[PDB]
Design a binder for these strands. Sequence first.
RNA 1: GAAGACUGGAGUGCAGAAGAGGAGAGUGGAAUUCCACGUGUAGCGGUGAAAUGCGUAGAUAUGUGGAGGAACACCAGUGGCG
Length: 115
Amino acid sequence: NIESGIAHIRSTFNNTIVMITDTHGNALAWSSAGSLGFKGSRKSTPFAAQMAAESAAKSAQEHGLKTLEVTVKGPGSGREAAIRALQAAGLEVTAIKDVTPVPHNGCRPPKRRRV
RNA sequence: GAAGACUGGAGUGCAGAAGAGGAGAGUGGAAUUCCACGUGUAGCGGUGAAAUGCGUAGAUAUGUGGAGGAACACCAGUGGCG
Ligand SMILES: [Mg+2]
Ligand SMILES: [Mg+2]
Ligand SMILES: [Mg+2]
Ligand SMILES: [Mg+2]
Ligand SMILES: [Mg+2]
Ligand SMILES: [Mg+2]
Ligand SMILES: [Mg+2]
Ligand SMILES: [Mg+2]
């Protein structure tokens, strides 16, 4: 029940999700700006991410772990706010990874807005 | 108009070069979607704000595997070819 683990962060233009999992992708705890009581446009603010990271971090310590590897996805603004909340909860960030899925000119995207 | 002559036009020969020029056959890797199975809990998604929609019949997230189709990240350049 006590081990190491890795954290997945998905920061987009609407919401942020922090997923805390084992080395081989087995879920331990998660939280999101929606689950902290935010409803609409305020889901995406950096403050909402800072609470979301802390709530998952505290529930992570209950199982007991210290070292983390952080993977980052999405273009959201909560990348910086979320990671430093993990450190301020008493854990160590070993590495930072960017896993935004760039395609090699694959499927075409939805049309532009106001067209 | 007719009979001859020439090589600065035009074309052939000889030695090199570059190119996303065209048609046919086969193959590759990212990524999206769907399907099956682990972990897991209450939201996800979306907007100027919202709502319709999806989710406790267990979603979003995450790890593994399978199927299929379309376009070819960097190179890439008032660069190239017709
Ligand atoms: Mg859209
Ligand atoms: Mg000549
Ligand atoms: Mg060719
Ligand atoms: Mg061709
Ligand atoms: Mg693939
Ligand atoms: Mg209003
Ligand atoms: Mg899934
Ligand atoms: Mg020409």
